[PDB]
Amino acid sequence: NDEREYLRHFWHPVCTVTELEKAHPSSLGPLAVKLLNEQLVVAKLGDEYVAMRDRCAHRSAKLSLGTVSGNRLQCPYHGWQYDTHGACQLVPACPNSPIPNKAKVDRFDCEERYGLIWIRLDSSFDCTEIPYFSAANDPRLRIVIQEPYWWDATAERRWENFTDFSHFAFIHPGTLFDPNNAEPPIVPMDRFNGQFRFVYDSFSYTCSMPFAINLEVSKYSSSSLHVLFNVSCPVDSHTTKNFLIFAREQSDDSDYLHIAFNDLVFAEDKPVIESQWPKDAPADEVSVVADKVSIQYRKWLRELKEAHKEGSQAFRSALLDPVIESDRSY
Amino acid sequence: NDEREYLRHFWHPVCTVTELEKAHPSSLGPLAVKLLNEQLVVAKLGDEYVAMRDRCAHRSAKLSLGTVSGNRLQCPYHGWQYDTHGACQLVPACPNSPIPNKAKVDRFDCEERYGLIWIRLDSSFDCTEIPYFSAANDPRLRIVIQEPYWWDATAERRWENFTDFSHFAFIHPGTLFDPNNAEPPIVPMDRFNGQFRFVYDSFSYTCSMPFAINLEVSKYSSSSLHVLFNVSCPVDSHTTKNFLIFAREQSDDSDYLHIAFNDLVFAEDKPVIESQWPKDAPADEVSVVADKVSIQYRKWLRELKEAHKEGSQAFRSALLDPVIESDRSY
Amino acid sequence: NDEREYLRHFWHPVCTVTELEKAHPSSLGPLAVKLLNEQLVVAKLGDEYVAMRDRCAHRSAKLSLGTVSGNRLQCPYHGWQYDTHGACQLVPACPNSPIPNKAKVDRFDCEERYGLIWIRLDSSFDCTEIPYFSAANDPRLRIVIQEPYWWDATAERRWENFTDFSHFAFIHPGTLFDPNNAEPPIVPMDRFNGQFRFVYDSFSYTCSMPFAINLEVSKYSSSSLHVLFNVSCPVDSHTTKNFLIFAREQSDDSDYLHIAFNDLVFAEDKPVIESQWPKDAPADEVSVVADKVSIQYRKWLRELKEAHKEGSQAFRSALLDPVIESDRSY
Amino acid sequence: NDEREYLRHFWHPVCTVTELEKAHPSSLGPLAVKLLNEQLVVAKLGDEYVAMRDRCAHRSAKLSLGTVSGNRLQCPYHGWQYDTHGACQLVPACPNSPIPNKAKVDRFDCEERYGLIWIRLDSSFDCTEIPYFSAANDPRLRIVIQEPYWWDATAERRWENFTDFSHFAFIHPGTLFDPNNAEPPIVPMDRFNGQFRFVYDSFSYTCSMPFAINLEVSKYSSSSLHVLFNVSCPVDSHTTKNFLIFAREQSDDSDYLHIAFNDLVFAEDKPVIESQWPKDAPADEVSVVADKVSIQYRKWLRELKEAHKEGSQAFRSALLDPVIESDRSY
Amino acid sequence: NDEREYLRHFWHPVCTVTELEKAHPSSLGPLAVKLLNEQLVVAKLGDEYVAMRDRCAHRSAKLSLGTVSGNRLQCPYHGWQYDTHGACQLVPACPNSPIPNKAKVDRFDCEERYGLIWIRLDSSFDCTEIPYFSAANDPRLRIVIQEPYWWDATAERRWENFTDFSHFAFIHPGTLFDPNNAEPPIVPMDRFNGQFRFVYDSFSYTCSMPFAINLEVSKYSSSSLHVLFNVSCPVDSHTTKNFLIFAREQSDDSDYLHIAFNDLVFAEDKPVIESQWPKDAPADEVSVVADKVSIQYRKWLRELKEAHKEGSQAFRSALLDPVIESDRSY
Amino acid sequence: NDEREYLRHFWHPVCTVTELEKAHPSSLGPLAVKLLNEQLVVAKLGDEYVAMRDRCAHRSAKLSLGTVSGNRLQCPYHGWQYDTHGACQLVPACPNSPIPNKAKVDRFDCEERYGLIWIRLDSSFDCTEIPYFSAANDPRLRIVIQEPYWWDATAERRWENFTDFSHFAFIHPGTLFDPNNAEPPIVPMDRFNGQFRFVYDSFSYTCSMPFAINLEVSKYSSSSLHVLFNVSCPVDSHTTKNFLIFAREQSDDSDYLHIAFNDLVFAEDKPVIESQWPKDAPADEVSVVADKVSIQYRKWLRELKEAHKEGSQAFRSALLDPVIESDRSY
Numbered sequence A, B, C, D, E, F: 001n002d003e004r005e006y007l008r009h010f011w012h013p014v015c016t017v018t019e020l021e022k023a024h025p026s027s028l029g030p031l032a033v034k035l036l037n038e039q040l041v042v043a044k045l046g047d048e049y050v051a052m053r054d055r056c057a058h059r060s061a062k063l064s065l066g067t068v069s070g071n072r073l074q075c076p077y078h079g080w081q082y083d084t085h086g087a088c089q090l091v092p093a094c095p096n097s098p099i100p101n102k103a104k105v106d107r108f109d110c111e112e113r114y115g116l117i118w119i120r121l122d123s124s125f126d127c128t129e130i131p132y133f134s135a136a137n138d139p140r141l142r143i144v145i146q147e148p149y150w151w152d153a154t155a156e157r158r159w160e161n162f163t164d165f166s167h168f169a170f171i172h173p174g175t176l177f178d179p180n181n182a183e184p185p186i187v188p189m190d191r192f193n194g195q196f197r198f199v200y201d202s203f204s205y206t207c208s209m210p211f212a213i214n215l216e217v218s219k220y221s222s223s224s225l226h227v228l229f230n231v232s233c234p235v236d237s238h239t240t241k242n243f244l245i246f247a248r249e250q251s252d253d254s255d256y257l258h259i260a261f262n263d264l265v266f267a268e269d270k271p272v273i274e275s276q277w278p279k280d281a282p283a284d285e286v287s288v289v290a291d292k293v294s295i296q297y298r299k300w301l302r303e304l305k306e307a308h309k310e311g312s313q314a315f316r317s318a319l320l321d322p323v324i325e326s327d328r329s330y
């Protein structure tokens, strides 16, 4: 718990826009979501996506069992109506009395981007941004947002799985493995603008810390751009709700050709990653040199955790200071 | 936790007589029941309903898997037989040896009333009685005992739901909400003989503390008496087993007209009440003036809990001293 | 928790050889097993059955999801290969670097006997042996290994059920209760070589402490030998995986006549034993003279628990010193 | 198919009044029922129970999915309203046009008696009555109507099972088999008023043809009257919906003592009777002298089948002519 | 069967393009579908959508269990490869022998349009076209293809339900009914170009015979165009697979607002339509004047059925001859 | 239908001996089985396995719900006892009366062989014998009888699947397909003693007509003998109960290595074979030269079916006359 408090300062995806619209016949929510073990409710009130604690101030019913009408989220129990700022603006039982100052629920940063809904629980450091997806607003590329997928594994373990190449021959032998490319090198890794940047051989990674990966592939078999954008919502201490968006230049083929392939890859990873125990990586794990990405990831996470304890300035420097290993200029 | 110790001093219903008779083909029980997280067993031993701890003194098997033999409860494992006082009177393997002095299980005050079985776990204060049901022994009324219904909510939250009128428009708009009588005002509430008494003008409540509600309705659409008796068994920290008995003066219609209607009402309340979290109301809940019944209820429970810590005489005064604010003469 | 640590010094069955061979198409395992709440993996590497902690040293994946490859157990994630001593001998991603000294997993004693796989978690006292089954090596007898049966009950409670005669009239009245022979006397019990030995007149028990029972019956209905070997794996604090092997001299009949009878007896015991609570017998249980076997059993277990605290030679003495009550010579 | 047409002339129970009142929240129905493979709908219109073909004349929707509205059954599709004679009296889409003469559905005899709803599909022979239940109107007796029980067996096979004593030692050895009274003799059987009447010494049968059995027991264990009334609804060619009403003079005990016993007896019979094949008894079945009751039953049924072909007065004579074997006077 | 043969001459939708692409990871099919009780397989071979009988010529395995590679559908059993014309072009067991002339399966007209796959089983009359959807290629309108929905009702009964207004007050009271528009008139109906054309008050219907409905609504509440395109696949004698495509001018709102509404309407219709029995409308159904659309629909279907028996010219005239009742010119 | 009458003249396996012993706790049966749509019962009566029609002569209950008593099969309903010839020898209700002459049920030739129970429904031609299994009574071979496996396919289609090599690349590419030995040629096939005999160079088939296959493999990868014996029970027109027995010379490996492999092979075949439709091969199937085994099999079955219509001597010649085309000397 206290060991995860620094994560409240980042933007995390909690649902797709589609999920929010499908939740109830109004198409406006509400939708219950869970983020860092906090129970939240999401709704569209007018033009705004709003996120509140899923707990009415009156008698603690779940607002996610209520109703969106226009610019209000109405509690299902005694009909208190909450506005976009989390403030109750109608107590139907006392329509002429003034509403208690108490009658407000916590309201959090909530924004749509790339077709996902993002929530930032703590905006006090004012230095984190929604992760970078390189294919957004590139009109050469067709974009597909997959349905979210749930794993009984943590966001850290999911991230390390996605950025590891050592596992292809054993988890993905028929699907991703390459006899003639069967142990890619140790590569230089740069920190720039709160992202890890590193390239392989052609795979170009931009990883917005802590849990998002933007992978641009310049493909060998077709010579056309493919982008994978994967981000894990840390739902609680043992669970992730994971999102994949993918973009492609050659878009004459079926979206489901790629969805089925992505789903096959995830199905091969899933049971092995869910088997890792304890859920959080303990100190006794044994790294080797080929674990560079994982080793550097864990080091930066540890530094961000320390810097959060020191405060806004220290956190901003730990996240945003550049640290360059490569020949590249940014 | 220790919050609930004072509740052990009250009589709580644990099952209907019908449930006890259906439990075992003999119609005498035994039946396993749970009350304030205690595992108990109820059986008809001779002319008496008896409650014991559901745990044999010999090797801890559940007596509820056993059988009533004569006027005794026989354990299923090695056949020890327990009398109405929880004392072992036969050890089949050693029929002539003396029975160990410790060969006994705790028993508890247990009585049938109104077709329910009631248990009081702690009788040491000796000032509580079985709640009041006004329709009992009224020849003019047909009485129907419904099957128990289980909620994932506490008895306090269930009580507050049953006595609140604010929620009709939102939970019961098609079934109970009167669009010409939305808000009855604050009414005076009296404490008398360990009951809350209050009237609307016609709904007359007599609420035997802590969890029983007797509601006499002098109906408007029929000019005839209807009585609802609702009481919650606090099974554990997050569960209630709830009992509804209803009585009616005009009794030539179908029982199932009313049962179906009550069931529909409970089905409307249930998911909202079960969503309330945390399960016990914290101090941060925000009341409005329309919540008088709930406010006064919580106040009295707090007083009973503090008086229990001060001992038998303090508790008896907190429970039984009158506090009148209406002009009714009792 | 610490009350059970002394049980780690004994050999416990964890699966049948059949279960191991059925686990994976290779017939070599791996198979996940759980013993005293430890997650272990069993595999056949060459001619050896091996047992390791089910947790890779690299990134903590379960080895039980991996593959046997010759004399090695290969992790499913990045293919680290472990030898019969639990030491990693191949890191495929770094195939010529020195393997970290840390790259080892805990390896436990593991042996086949009687068609079961046995594990001893702690071999430090070097004085325990796999329990004795008298029918092994006897060409006169046909041996049948039943499928394991799981109970929600501890190994101590299961052992006391199997060696008690008092319960027949109440649990097994149609099946084992002899109405003309309804109370076998208290018999002398010998401790010899870490076994309880006692005889009823014809039932000869050799009970390898703590959880195995070898029962030799010279039957009253055939003049033929029948052996029952029952042993309970203590899977965790509330669960047993139980094994029955039986042997018989007159073997021209169907194995399933006997299997169905054993299963019927176990089904009659099961719900009563599973109801016993709390799972471990508290000090408050009330014994009678007929309970001699379980009284003496509990005494010896407590002696073994005390001696374990005192260290290796106290434990050896408590386990293996003779204590003779009968007129028999050993 | 045509072999069963004569059964349409009798009254058959189709549901309990309780089932009808529970079907729909209004307590008035409608309820879908099936009798001799006809799909019917039952409803309470005013003070009358009505039974119609469950098929609207307009577009063939099921009226059982509709609503009772005063003295009318309203179709769910376009709201045509049917009166107690099955005639449409309102076409909402054409509220002042003349209603087509075709706008009528078949209406069948429907009456409540003993707490069951009875239907007679063909009243043309005007000689059948609702079966006789002797305990009705008797203030000395407490009456209990059990929930209906469904069997995969025909009404004839169920009737022959209920009136056979030969099967007790094999189906009911623990439950009804009297080892000292193991073969009741052949008894004289009288036909009187469309009933078989026969007596065993104390068991007095009055069997209203074809499917109802009234059994009056003067018990050997109390000197008290016990009545069993069993009747089978022939739902289709292989299914029965069966009804048991029982009455007892000594009524201070639990209803559920008796219900559980009846249910245990029925559960013992059920799989054997359901196994009988083909469902209707072929001519090749081999009778013995002990089968007198079922031999005479089969003879009378065949007589009724022959007489139905001959028309109304032959059937009346076959049903109601007396045929006396005993010394009794009627 | 013979009574449905005329339907083989029309184009019927059998799946969405999305369903075909999702069926297997190739994204090319194959997909099993059923049309007029014929088992068919659909695949994308190169650029073409192809439909064949789902039955290999060799040993009658289902081609729908096989694999699409490029321009071939490979049988799962012995790998015979079929081309876009249904001809086997590779017998892997006899790669040098010539392929039997027998080695071909029936191939049917198969075309994508509007995002659905359409099949015409009989092209011999050469005068039927894929039904008309007015919103196709109108760039003012956003188009949404719903997931198909299955009903246990025939295409005729589904069509008549969709074009009836009489049922709103009873099936759709809260969702479509209008007190102040509560019985729309009898309207003129034109036959033109194989479509029924009729308008209401503003609802404009173009119904391509036999099973498609294109409804253009000029809405009262928003003054913007909404188009509903509903077509029923006659899967067999009692089943429809139904498709809804809808288009809207005001497309700033959520697609799921409309999907949820359409799904609610269908859920209200579904149980009533599925209750209609027999599945095909028999002669005894009673029409009233307000049934004009249904009456005229059944008349044209009957004429098409007669004309099919007479041949191509007669069928073409029955389908395509104009029959004008309205003031309109086409 | 009448197509299958000739199959009644052959011996078919109906269950394993293990299945019979497991059916009832006595280990003697009875066990219900179905063969060519006949409902039969098998029991061990004394030293004999007996098959009767599963239908009591008295009131048609299933004898398979009864019990073996001594050397008789006792009906569950009224306890009639049937001897090994199907004759009733005890009528409990009339123990002294003469037993009706018709109190008997049909019995059928029934024998154990190889650990299976075989039944021949029609013994009148008296020229068929139980199929040949070459490994029986060979000391060098360990024999494993697998559990039966059920397919929704006919015995003919299952036989043709088992003897076809064409399908390996497509159904079994990972498990059986040899990429260097795809096509063995047409081989000569001999008819001898009612068996098909044919050899590949090493696979030697002896196929006892109609449904049994004995395959002797002189393996290449081990230089040791492996025998597969597969036989299908034609349960009804669309179902088979299939039996696999396998024998091996090198028998120090795990039985479950082989069982798992066989099960994987059957799992690969099963959905393709079950998809073949219609269930019986019609005349429109297209054979190629590689189908010789299947072509010759169907030819011989057609001859047996025609010879059966001509009578006992014609059938005996069709079945037993030799037809040699190899140069082997028998």
Ligand code: FES
Binding pocket: A056, A057, A058, A059, A060, A061, A075, A076, A077, A078, A079, A080
């Ligand atoms: S709990 Fe939300 S309005 Fe009362």
Ligand code: FES
Binding pocket: B056, B057, B058, B059, B060, B061, B075, B076, B077, B078, B079, B080
């Ligand atoms: S545990 Fe109850 S008698 Fe032994």
Ligand code: FES
Binding pocket: C056, C057, C058, C059, C060, C061, C075, C076, C077, C078, C079, C080
């Ligand atoms: S977790 Fe085992 S090899 Fe990496």
Ligand code: FES
Binding pocket: D056, D057, D058, D059, D060, D061, D075, D076, D077, D078, D079, D080
């Ligand atoms: S189908 Fe009943 S009113 Fe139309």
Ligand code: FES
Binding pocket: E056, E057, E058, E059, E060, E061, E075, E076, E077, E078, E079, E080
């Ligand atoms: S059944 Fe299709 S290739 Fe043989």
Ligand code: FES
Binding pocket: F056, F057, F058, F059, F060, F061, F075, F076, F077, F078, F079, F080
């Ligand atoms: S039916 Fe078998 S003994 Fe009566």
Ligand SMILES: [Fe+3]
Binding pocket: A161, A162, A167, A171, A172, A265, A269
């Ligand atoms: Fe992966």
Ligand SMILES: [Fe+3]
Binding pocket: B161, B167, B171, B172, B265, B269
């Ligand atoms: Fe309520």
Ligand SMILES: [Fe+3]
Binding pocket: C161, C162, C167, C171, C172, C265, C269
């Ligand atoms: Fe036991």
Ligand SMILES: [Fe+3]
Binding pocket: D161, D162, D167, D171, D172, D265, D269
């Ligand atoms: Fe019976």
Ligand SMILES: [Fe+3]
Binding pocket: E161, E162, E167, E171, E172, E265, E269
């Ligand atoms: Fe509709």
Ligand SMILES: [Fe+3]
Binding pocket: F161, F167, F171, F172, F265, F269
């Ligand atoms: Fe195969």
